[PDB]
Design a protein around this motif. Sequence first.
Motif, PDB file in Angstrom:
ATOM      1  N   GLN A 291     -11.581  -8.735   6.103  1.00 26.28           N
ATOM      2  CA  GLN A 291     -12.122  -7.600   6.859  1.00 26.28           C
ATOM      3  C   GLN A 291     -11.433  -6.265   6.553  1.00 26.28           C
ATOM      4  O   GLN A 291     -11.621  -5.705   5.465  1.00 26.28           O
ATOM      5  CB  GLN A 291     -12.080  -7.884   8.366  1.00 26.28           C
ATOM      6  N   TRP A 292     -10.638  -5.747   7.501  1.00 27.71           N
ATOM      7  CA  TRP A 292     -10.206  -4.350   7.545  1.00 27.71           C
ATOM      8  C   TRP A 292      -8.747  -4.172   7.103  1.00 27.71           C
ATOM      9  O   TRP A 292      -8.035  -5.135   6.800  1.00 27.71           O
ATOM     10  CB  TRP A 292     -10.381  -3.797   8.961  1.00 27.71           C
ATOM     11  N   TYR A 293      -8.295  -2.909   7.084  1.00 23.33           N
ATOM     12  CA  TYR A 293      -6.893  -2.592   6.806  1.00 23.33           C
ATOM     13  C   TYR A 293      -6.059  -2.709   8.076  1.00 23.33           C
ATOM     14  O   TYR A 293      -6.444  -2.202   9.131  1.00 23.33           O
ATOM     15  CB  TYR A 293      -6.735  -1.170   6.252  1.00 23.33           C
ATOM     16  N   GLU A 294      -4.889  -3.343   7.959  1.00 26.06           N
ATOM     17  CA  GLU A 294      -4.002  -3.560   9.105  1.00 26.06           C
ATOM     18  C   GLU A 294      -3.322  -2.290   9.593  1.00 26.06           C
ATOM     19  O   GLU A 294      -2.643  -2.335  10.623  1.00 26.06           O
ATOM     20  CB  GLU A 294      -2.910  -4.580   8.766  1.00 26.06           C
ATOM     21  N   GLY A 295      -3.473  -1.182   8.885  1.00 24.61           N
ATOM     22  CA  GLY A 295      -2.748   0.027   9.209  1.00 24.61           C
ATOM     23  C   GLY A 295      -2.697   0.930   7.998  1.00 24.61           C
ATOM     24  O   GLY A 295      -3.153   0.574   6.911  1.00 24.61           O
ATOM     25  N   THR A 296      -2.126   2.121   8.213  1.00 25.38           N
ATOM     26  CA  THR A 296      -2.115   3.137   7.161  1.00 25.38           C
ATOM     27  C   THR A 296      -1.281   2.698   5.965  1.00 25.38           C
ATOM     28  O   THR A 296      -1.606   3.036   4.819  1.00 25.38           O
ATOM     29  CB  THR A 296      -1.602   4.467   7.723  1.00 25.38           C
ATOM     30  N   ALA A 297      -0.211   1.938   6.202  1.00 26.91           N
ATOM     31  CA  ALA A 297       0.559   1.437   5.079  1.00 26.91           C
ATOM     32  C   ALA A 297      -0.207   0.354   4.336  1.00 26.91           C
ATOM     33  O   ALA A 297      -0.130   0.260   3.108  1.00 26.91           O
ATOM     34  CB  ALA A 297       1.913   0.910   5.559  1.00 26.91           C
ATOM     35  N   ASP A 298      -0.925  -0.497   5.069  1.00 32.33           N
ATOM     36  CA  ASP A 298      -1.721  -1.528   4.418  1.00 32.33           C
ATOM     37  C   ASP A 298      -2.839  -0.914   3.588  1.00 32.33           C
ATOM     38  O   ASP A 298      -3.260  -1.497   2.584  1.00 32.33           O
ATOM     39  CB  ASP A 298      -2.289  -2.483   5.464  1.00 32.33           C
ATOM     40  N   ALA A 299      -3.319   0.267   3.988  1.00 36.07           N
ATOM     41  CA  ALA A 299      -4.375   0.933   3.239  1.00 36.07           C
ATOM     42  C   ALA A 299      -3.914   1.291   1.831  1.00 36.07           C
ATOM     43  O   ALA A 299      -4.731   1.332   0.905  1.00 36.07           O
ATOM     44  CB  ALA A 299      -4.854   2.176   3.985  1.00 36.07           C
ATOM     45  N   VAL A 300      -2.618   1.511   1.638  1.00 39.22           N
ATOM     46  CA  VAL A 300      -2.107   1.702   0.286  1.00 39.22           C
ATOM     47  C   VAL A 300      -1.715   0.377  -0.345  1.00 39.22           C
ATOM     48  O   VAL A 300      -2.029   0.121  -1.512  1.00 39.22           O
ATOM     49  CB  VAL A 300      -0.924   2.687   0.288  1.00 39.22           C
ATOM     50  N   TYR A 301      -1.022  -0.470   0.418  1.00 38.02           N
ATOM     51  CA  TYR A 301      -0.555  -1.745  -0.114  1.00 38.02           C
ATOM     52  C   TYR A 301      -1.689  -2.540  -0.755  1.00 38.02           C
ATOM     53  O   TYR A 301      -1.525  -3.098  -1.843  1.00 38.02           O
ATOM     54  CB  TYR A 301       0.103  -2.567   0.996  1.00 38.02           C
ATOM     55  N   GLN A 302      -2.853  -2.596  -0.098  1.00 39.20           N
ATOM     56  CA  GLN A 302      -3.938  -3.431  -0.597  1.00 39.20           C
ATOM     57  C   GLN A 302      -4.437  -2.969  -1.956  1.00 39.20           C
ATOM     58  O   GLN A 302      -5.057  -3.756  -2.673  1.00 39.20           O
ATOM     59  CB  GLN A 302      -5.100  -3.460   0.405  1.00 39.20           C
ATOM     60  N   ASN A 303      -4.163  -1.724  -2.336  1.00 36.43           N
ATOM     61  CA  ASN A 303      -4.722  -1.154  -3.553  1.00 36.43           C
ATOM     62  C   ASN A 303      -3.648  -0.811  -4.575  1.00 36.43           C
ATOM     63  O   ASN A 303      -3.890  -0.009  -5.487  1.00 36.43           O
ATOM     64  CB  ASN A 303      -5.568   0.076  -3.215  1.00 36.43           C
TER      65      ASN A 303
ATOM     66  N   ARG B 117       7.897  -4.587   0.896  1.00 43.77           N
ATOM     67  CA  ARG B 117       8.775  -5.120   1.937  1.00 43.77           C
ATOM     68  C   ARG B 117       8.133  -4.998   3.310  1.00 43.77           C
ATOM     69  O   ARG B 117       8.368  -5.839   4.184  1.00 43.77           O
ATOM     70  CB  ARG B 117      10.139  -4.420   1.945  1.00 43.77           C
ATOM     71  N   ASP B 118       7.323  -3.963   3.518  1.00 41.96           N
ATOM     72  CA  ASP B 118       6.590  -3.848   4.770  1.00 41.96           C
ATOM     73  C   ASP B 118       5.548  -4.949   4.896  1.00 41.96           C
ATOM     74  O   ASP B 118       5.365  -5.519   5.978  1.00 41.96           O
ATOM     75  CB  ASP B 118       5.936  -2.474   4.867  1.00 41.96           C
ATOM     76  N   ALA B 119       4.862  -5.271   3.798  1.00 43.36           N
ATOM     77  CA  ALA B 119       3.862  -6.333   3.844  1.00 43.36           C
ATOM     78  C   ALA B 119       4.493  -7.690   4.161  1.00 43.36           C
ATOM     79  O   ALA B 119       3.883  -8.520   4.846  1.00 43.36           O
ATOM     80  CB  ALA B 119       3.101  -6.385   2.523  1.00 43.36           C
ATOM     81  N   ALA B 120       5.713  -7.939   3.671  1.00 36.42           N
ATOM     82  CA  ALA B 120       6.397  -9.194   3.963  1.00 36.42           C
ATOM     83  C   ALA B 120       6.979  -9.229   5.370  1.00 36.42           C
ATOM     84  O   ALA B 120       7.494 -10.271   5.791  1.00 36.42           O
ATOM     85  CB  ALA B 120       7.505  -9.438   2.933  1.00 36.42           C
TER      86      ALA B 120
ATOM     87  N   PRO C  18       6.653  -9.536   9.169  1.00 35.63           N
ATOM     88  CA  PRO C  18       5.732  -9.850  10.275  1.00 35.63           C
ATOM     89  C   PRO C  18       5.873  -8.911  11.464  1.00 35.63           C
ATOM     90  O   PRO C  18       4.905  -8.744  12.215  1.00 35.63           O
ATOM     91  CB  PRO C  18       6.105 -11.293  10.649  1.00 35.63           C
ATOM     92  N   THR C  19       7.050  -8.301  11.664  1.00 31.81           N
ATOM     93  CA  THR C  19       7.234  -7.329  12.745  1.00 31.81           C
ATOM     94  C   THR C  19       6.270  -6.154  12.627  1.00 31.81           C
ATOM     95  O   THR C  19       5.851  -5.587  13.647  1.00 31.81           O
ATOM     96  CB  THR C  19       8.683  -6.820  12.745  1.00 31.81           C
ATOM     97  N   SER C  20       5.875  -5.807  11.401  1.00 31.64           N
ATOM     98  CA  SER C  20       5.246  -4.523  11.110  1.00 31.64           C
ATOM     99  C   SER C  20       3.788  -4.476  11.550  1.00 31.64           C
ATOM    100  O   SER C  20       3.014  -5.400  11.285  1.00 31.64           O
ATOM    101  CB  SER C  20       5.346  -4.234   9.610  1.00 31.64           C
ATOM    102  N   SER C  21       3.412  -3.387  12.210  1.00 33.91           N
ATOM    103  CA  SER C  21       2.004  -3.068  12.387  1.00 33.91           C
ATOM    104  C   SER C  21       1.418  -2.348  11.163  1.00 33.91           C
ATOM    105  O   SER C  21       0.318  -1.790  11.256  1.00 33.91           O
ATOM    106  CB  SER C  21       1.799  -2.236  13.661  1.00 33.91           C
ATOM    107  N   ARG C  22       2.151  -2.352  10.037  1.00 28.61           N
ATOM    108  CA  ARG C  22       1.638  -1.964   8.719  1.00 28.61           C
ATOM    109  C   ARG C  22       1.171  -0.508   8.694  1.00 28.61           C
ATOM    110  O   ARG C  22       0.165  -0.162   8.070  1.00 28.61           O
ATOM    111  CB  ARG C  22       0.530  -2.919   8.272  1.00 28.61           C
ATOM    112  N   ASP C  23       1.950   0.357   9.333  1.00 34.23           N
ATOM    113  CA  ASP C  23       1.600   1.745   9.576  1.00 34.23           C
ATOM    114  C   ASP C  23       2.715   2.652   9.078  1.00 34.23           C
ATOM    115  O   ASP C  23       3.901   2.339   9.238  1.00 34.23           O
ATOM    116  CB  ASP C  23       1.376   1.968  11.072  1.00 34.23           C
ATOM    117  N   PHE C  24       2.338   3.783   8.480  1.00 36.12           N
ATOM    118  CA  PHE C  24       3.347   4.733   8.016  1.00 36.12           C
ATOM    119  C   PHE C  24       4.169   5.274   9.180  1.00 36.12           C
ATOM    120  O   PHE C  24       5.402   5.162   9.197  1.00 36.12           O
ATOM    121  CB  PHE C  24       2.687   5.884   7.254  1.00 36.12           C
TER     122      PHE C  24
END
Lengths: 415, 415, 415, 415
Positions: free
Chosen positions: A100-112, A217-220, A222-228
Motif C-alpha cells: 500500500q502506502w508510505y509509512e512516513g516522509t522518511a519511508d517516501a525516500v527509503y522506498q525509492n 538505519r531508520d528502516a531497520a 521498529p521504534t521509528s514512525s519513518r518520518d523526517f
Amino acid sequence: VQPLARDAMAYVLAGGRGSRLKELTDRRAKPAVYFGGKARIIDFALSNALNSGIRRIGVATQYKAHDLIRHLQRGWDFFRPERNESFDILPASQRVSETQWYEGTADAVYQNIDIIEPYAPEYMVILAGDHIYKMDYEYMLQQHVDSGADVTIGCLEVPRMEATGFGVMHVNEKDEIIDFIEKPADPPGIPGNEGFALASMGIYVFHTKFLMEALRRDAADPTSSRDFGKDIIPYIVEHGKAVAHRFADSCVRSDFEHEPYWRDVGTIDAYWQANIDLTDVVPDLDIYDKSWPIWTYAEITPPAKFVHDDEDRRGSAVSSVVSGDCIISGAALNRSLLFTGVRANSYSRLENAVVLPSVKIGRHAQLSNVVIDHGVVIPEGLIVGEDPELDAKRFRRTESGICLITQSMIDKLDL
Amino acid sequence: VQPLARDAMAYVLAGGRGSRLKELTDRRAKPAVYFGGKARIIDFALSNALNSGIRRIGVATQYKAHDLIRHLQRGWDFFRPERNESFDILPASQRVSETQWYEGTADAVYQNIDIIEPYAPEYMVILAGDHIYKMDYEYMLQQHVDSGADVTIGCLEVPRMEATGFGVMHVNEKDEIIDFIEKPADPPGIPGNEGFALASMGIYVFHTKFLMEALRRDAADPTSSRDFGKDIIPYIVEHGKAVAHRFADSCVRSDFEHEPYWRDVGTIDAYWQANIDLTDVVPDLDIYDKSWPIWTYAEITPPAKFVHDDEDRRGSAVSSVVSGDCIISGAALNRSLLFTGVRANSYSRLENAVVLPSVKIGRHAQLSNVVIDHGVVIPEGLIVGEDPELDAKRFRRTESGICLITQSMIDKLDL
Amino acid sequence: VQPLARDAMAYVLAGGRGSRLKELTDRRAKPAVYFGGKARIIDFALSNALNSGIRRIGVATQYKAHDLIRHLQRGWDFFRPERNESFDILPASQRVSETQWYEGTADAVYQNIDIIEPYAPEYMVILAGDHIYKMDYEYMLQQHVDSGADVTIGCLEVPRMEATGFGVMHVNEKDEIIDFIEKPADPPGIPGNEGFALASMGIYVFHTKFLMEALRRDAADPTSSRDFGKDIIPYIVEHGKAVAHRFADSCVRSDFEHEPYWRDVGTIDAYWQANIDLTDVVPDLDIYDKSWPIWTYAEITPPAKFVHDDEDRRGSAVSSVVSGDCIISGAALNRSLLFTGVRANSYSRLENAVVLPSVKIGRHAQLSNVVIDHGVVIPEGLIVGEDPELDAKRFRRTESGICLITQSMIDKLDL
Amino acid sequence: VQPLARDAMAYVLAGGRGSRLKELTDRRAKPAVYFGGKARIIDFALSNALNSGIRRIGVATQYKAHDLIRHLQRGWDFFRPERNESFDILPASQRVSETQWYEGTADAVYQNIDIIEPYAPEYMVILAGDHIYKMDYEYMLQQHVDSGADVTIGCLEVPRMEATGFGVMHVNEKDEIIDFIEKPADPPGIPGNEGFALASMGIYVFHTKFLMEALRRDAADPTSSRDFGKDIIPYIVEHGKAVAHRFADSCVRSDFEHEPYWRDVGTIDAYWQANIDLTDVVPDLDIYDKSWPIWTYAEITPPAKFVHDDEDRRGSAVSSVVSGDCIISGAALNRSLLFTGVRANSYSRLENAVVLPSVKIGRHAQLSNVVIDHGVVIPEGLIVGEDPELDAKRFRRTESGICLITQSMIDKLDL
C-alpha cells in the motif's frame, strides 16, 4: 568553482493530505490545489528546484494522487535523460512494495533508493511540496558543504508567539541546532534576537551518501514512525551536526515584495486570504516577477471577455484578477480572483470571491466571501454571504465567515 | 476509403507585404500581423491545414520575414518527420539560386521543388497566408479528385457589387470556370443565381505532378511575371479544366457564427473593424470555439489584473476583450481589444481601441478610435480622437477617423 | 555563491565557410558539417554552453546557411522564454539593415545588439562554432570576474612549431596578454616553458556593457576589418587588460580521454583523421561519455542490420563504428565510420572510409581512404584507392591519398 | 464526407499479465515487454491508432504497471488537448472507484466512462495492447457504420487447426457472426473456404453511445465476469448484430512483407522466434518501413561500435541486428538481435540470442539460444547452450532449447 546544484537531486514530499482544508482536498492532495490564478501549490517548489539549477527531481505521491500525477505528467514533461535531466513520479504502490502506502516522509525516500543511487547525486534536497515560496537552493547547498553539517535545515525567522504552531529549532550563536521541539508553548528565541524563533520549513539538505545510510538505519528501526521531522532529524540534532539555514538568506524577493514571502495555506481562511491578497494594489506576492518564474501546466487559451453595458447589467471586474477563457457577461466582479475557464452570467455579482477553474455562475446569483471549488455550477439566484446561519447549514463556513462551496454541497440544495 | 489529406501537403504563400496596411507592415509581412488577441494572421491557414489532417506544410516567405520566421520557428515546431509530418520554412536567399528574392507566387513554389518531390505528396493545397477563415480542406480535395480538374479553386459567394474588388471566376452551371477577370466593373453572376459572383480566395488545389510540370513551363517562359493568379491560373482556365469550389461547402462554422466568416483585413479600417467586432455580444468570429481551434505561439503568462477603485480613478474594462499579462491600473477601457502584455496606467482612457502586444499607456492619456502598434509607449496625457486635423498631422488617420499609431510617430511629436 | 553562467549569453560565431574543406562546404557552412557519426560540428559549442548552464544562446549565421538554420530549428528547439531561456538564430539579413551580409566576426555581434540588450546579460561568452572540443565555461567566467580583465581569451597550450597556423598570445608572469600575433612564423613562448605557445581558441569572455561599447567603437573606425581577433582583441591587449585562460583548466575530460581534446578539422585530411580515429580501441575523444553529453538533432531510427554469410559475401563491420538505419548487406567494412542511413550492398568493401548520412554503396564497389559526402550514390563496381593518378583526376584527392567524393563528381564519369 | 477516425477514441487494454512468458513479465506487464530492437509491444497498437488518424487514446493498465506507465509518460507525451488530442493513462485505482483491481476488460472501460463521455467521441475502437501488428483502423470504422452493426470485430483468417487457440467467430456468407466459441477443439470454418477459420483479434468497434449503455448493462449484471470476450461480445451476436472485419483488408503491409503480419508472442519460444526472425535476409516484419512508422520512446544514443581484430578475438556481428549504444568489444555475434546499450566483452560469443537493453556479457562467456532480460550482467566465462541438463537446472529452459536468463537466476549461481 562549479555550482553544487549540478550534483544535487530535489526530492519533493507531495503526499500531504491537507486535512484542515476539508472538502477542498477531498479529491486532491494539497500539493495539487490551485493557487494564484493558474498554478498549483506543487509548482513553487518544483520551480525553485528548476530556477536553482537542479536538473534531477523526484516527487513522492500518496493520498488521492491521480490529479497530482496527471498535472505532473504534463506540466513537467520536458526533462531529457540524455542531458542528465530527470523528473521521476514516485507514487506509493506495489513496486518492490506490495504493501500500500508510505509509512512516513522518511519511508517516501527509503522506498525509492533504487531510483536515486543510479543517478548518484552528491547532495539530496528534501522539499515539502505543499508551501508557496520562492527560494534559491544553491545558498543552502553551499552552507551545508561549508559547514560540514550532517543535515542543514531551512528555517523561517518568525515572532516567537507565532512560532508556537511550528516545529522550532533551538540554535546557538553558530546557528547549530542544539534542540528541536514540536509546537513549544514558549519557543526558544534566537541568541541575541530573542524576539524571534526559527521555524522549520521542512527543507533538508544532506550528502546523498549520509542520507542513504540514515534512511536504511531508520528502516531497520521498529521504534521509528519513518518520518523526517519525528525520527530522522531529532536523531541528528542529538548525536550529529544539524545546522540552520535562514530563509531570509536564500529567499528570492522581487523588487515589489516587501518581505520574504512564505505561506502554508493550511486552513480555508489562510487559503482564501493568500489568494484574495493577490487583488491588492501592491500584493505581498509578485505574480508578475519575470526573474524567478513559476512554471506550471498551461494551455493556449482565448482571452478574457467583458460584455453588456445597459441600464440593468454591466459585465465588469474591479480590483480583481481574471484569467484567460473567462467570459464576464453582465456580471459584476469586485475584489475577486478568477482562475481559467470561468463563466459569469447576467445580473450575477461576485465579491471577495476565490473562483477556481471552470466555474459557472448562474444569472442573478450573488456571492460574497467564498471559495468556489473547481467546476462548480452555481445555480441562478443563489445568495451566499447574506445569512450566516443559512450559509453555515448549506456549506462549509469558517468562523471568520468564508464559505467553501463544492458541487456536492450545491447538489444537496433546493434550500 | 483513405482520407486524401494524408497524401496532401499544404503550401502557404506568406510573402504578402500588406501594402495598404501602411506602417503596420513596415517592419513585418502581413501574415505576421497580429489578430484577434493572441494569434497572427498566418495561424488561420496553418491551423486549417492541421485540423483538416494535412501532415506536411511548407511556408514561402520573403518581405521582412524575421518576425514571421521567428513566429513559425517557435510556434509551429511540433512536427516530427519519423511520423511522416514535416513543416518547412522556405525563405528567399542563397539556395539553389543565390542573389535576389522570389519572382512571384508561382516562383515561390518553383524555387523549392527540390523540397517537395522527396515527400512525393499526391496533392498540393496552395493557400494564401494573409486571410482569416476556417476551412476543412478535405472537402476541396475530394471535389478535385472526383472532378478530374487540373485545378480546383476556392471561391467566396459574394453579392456582385462587392465582387468588383476581387479576382472573379466566371462559372458555368457545372461550376466549371470559363473565364477569370481581375476586378470586373460588373462582375459576371453565378448562372441561375445572378445576384452573386464567385470571388477567388487564392486557394488552389492540384495533383502534384501536374503542378510541377506547370511550374517548370512558367519558369522557362521569360515573359511570365511568375505568378499564380496572373500567369498559371489564366492558362488553365483557357486550355485546361478549372473548377470552382464554394467556400460555403467547406467553411467550419461555429454554432455561434451567423454565416461563413472570411476577412482579408486589407485596409486599416478593415483591420480595425475585424478586431473591434470581437468586442460584440454576438461576434461574427467565435474565438471561443473548441471544435476547430487556432494554434499559435503562446507562453505561460500571468492573468489580467484590474486595480484602483476610488473617486478619481477605477481600473476596469467594459464591452472589451483583455488578454493575459495585462495590468489595467486605474485605466478605463471600453469597446477595446488588448493583446497580451499591455499596461494602462492611472487616469488613462481607451475607447474603440485595438492595442497590440506590450503597449504602455501613460497616465491621463485618452485615445479613441485607434490601432496602437506593438510595443508603442503612449506618453502621459496624450489625446487622440478629439481633433481630427491634429490627429491626421501626428499619425496615420483613415478616411473614417481611425488613427494608426507607431513608435516612430510618437518620437516625432513635441514640436 | 551564484553561478556566473546564470547571467551569461553564449554568442556562437557560425559564419565560417571552411574553404579548405573544399567540396564538403560547397552546399553548407562548416558548422553544419557532420562529425562523429551523428552530430554536427556546431553541436559541440552549443552543448558546452548548455552543459555549462548558460541559458541564452545566439548563433550568427550567413545567408549561405539553409542547412545550418534547419538543423538549429529542429535540434535546438527546447528553450522557453518564460523560463528565461532563449535560442536566437541570427542570420545576416535585411531586418533594419538593408544589407544582407556581415562584415566580420565583430560586426556579426554588433548588428544584433538590439537582440542582446533587452536580455541584459551580465556577461557575453563569444564562441567559435566550428571546433570540436568540450569545455566548462563557468571556469572562464570565474577567472574573468576575479582577474578584472577587459577580455579573457581561451588558449590552447601547444608546441610552438605547431602554433604557427594560429593567432598566438605572448603572455607574462601572470598569464596577462602583452601581445597578439597572427600566425607568427616563429611564435613566442610561455615564461618558464618557452617550448610551448598559447594559441587562441576564438573563445572570448566580456562584461556585456564593455563589449557593446567596444563593438560601437569598432563599427565607427573605418580602419577596422570588423573582427574580434584582428581588431577588437589587439586593441585591448595594448590599451586595456587581456588575460589568457588555458583550455587545460576547463576542458571536460572523460576518464577515457588521455589529454584535452580540441580539433579544427580545417583540412580534408584532418576531418578524415578526426572521424577515423573514433574507430580506435581507445579513441582520443570519448563519444560514449555521459557526464558531458552532446545534444543534437536525432530521429527515431531502426537499428543497424548486417546480412549475408556465404562463401562469396559476408555483411559485417570490423574495427568500425556503424550508426542506426544502416543495412550492411553482404558488405565488408573495416576501420570505417558510417553515419545514419547508409546502405552497402553485396560484395562491396569499405576500408578507412568516413561515410556521411544516407550514402548508398552499390554492389562490388571497393573504396579505400575516402570521405563520402551526404547522400552520394556510389555506382556498382566503382574502385577508389587502387590507382592514385586516376583517383586524382576523378575526385578531390589529397596529398596524403584521401579521396573526397561528391555526387557532382560521380555524375561526371563513365570512365 | 470526413474521415471517421476524427470522431474515434482508441481504448487500449493493457492489463495483461502475459503469464506464459514467465520471468520475462515478473515485474513488467506484457504490453511493456520490449520487441524488435527498440519499441515495446504496446507501441504497435498505439502507433496504429496514431497513423490511422485517431487523436484520442485511452490506456487501461492494472495499477502497479510502473514500467508501463513510465514508458507512456515519456514516450507518448506529445498530444495537446487544445488541438483536440488527448492521451490518458488509466490505471486501476481508487478515485471514483475503489476496487484496487479491474474486474475484467469491460470493467476496465466502465470505470473510466467519466473520462470518455466529456470527449463525446462518436466511436470507440477497443484494442488489445499485447499484440504486434500494423493495421489502418479507418477501414474497420467505415465498415462498422456502412454495415449498421452493433459490434465490428477484427479477425484473422487462419487455418482451422491453428485457430484452436483463439476465440473463434463462426461466420456466414455475409460475414455476420452466428456464434463465438472460446478455444474450439474443432473450429468451424468459413463458407466458400472451409479450410480456414476466423480468429478474434480482441479488437472491437462500437458506436460510443451503444457501448456506454452496454457497459452499464454489464456492470448491473452479477452473472457477468465484466469481460469483453466472455460477456458483452456473445450477448450481442445472439441478441444484436455482430459483423466480422477481416485483418487482411485493413492490414498495412510493406512492399517487403509477404503476408499480413500478426504475433501475440505468448510463449518464450514465440517471443524468441519473432525477435530472431528479424535477423533474416527477408524478415516477415519490415522494421525499416517508413510508411507506417512505429513511434516509441527513444533517446539520442551513441552509434554501435565494433572493436578488436587479432587472431585471438574479433568484435563483429554477422547476420544480426545491433542497436545503438552497443559496444561489441572482441565479441563474436551471429544471428542475434541486440537492443540498445548492450556491452559484449572480449572473447565472448552470442548465437541465436535475443538481448534486451543494457545487458553486459562478461569476457569468455558463450551463450546460444537465449533470451537475456533487461539489464542482466552475464558473469565471465559463463556457458549456456552446451549442456541441456545443466542449463535447465540454472535457467528457465523451453523444450525447444531456448533459455531465458534473468539477474535472479544469475545471482543464484555457483554451478
